[PDB]
Homo-oligomer: A and B are copies of this chain.
């Protein structure tokens, strides 16, 4: 069981 969470804030 693997979890992948990205967050990208690029102005």
Contact = CB atoms under 8 A, between A and B. Distances in A.
A1 B2 CA distance: 5
Interface string A1-11: 11111111111
A6 B1 contact: no
A6 to B, nearest CB: 4
B3 A6 contact: no
Contacts of A1: 1-3
A7 to B, nearest CB: 5
A9 B2 CA distance: 14
A3 B11 CA distance: 13
Given A4-B7, A6-B8, A7-B8, 18 more contacts: A1-B1, A1-B2, A1-B3, A2-B4, A2-B7, A3-B3, A4-B6, A4-B8, A5-B9, A6-B7, A6-B9, A8-B9, A9-B9, A9-B10, A9-B11, A10-B10, A10-B11, A11-B11
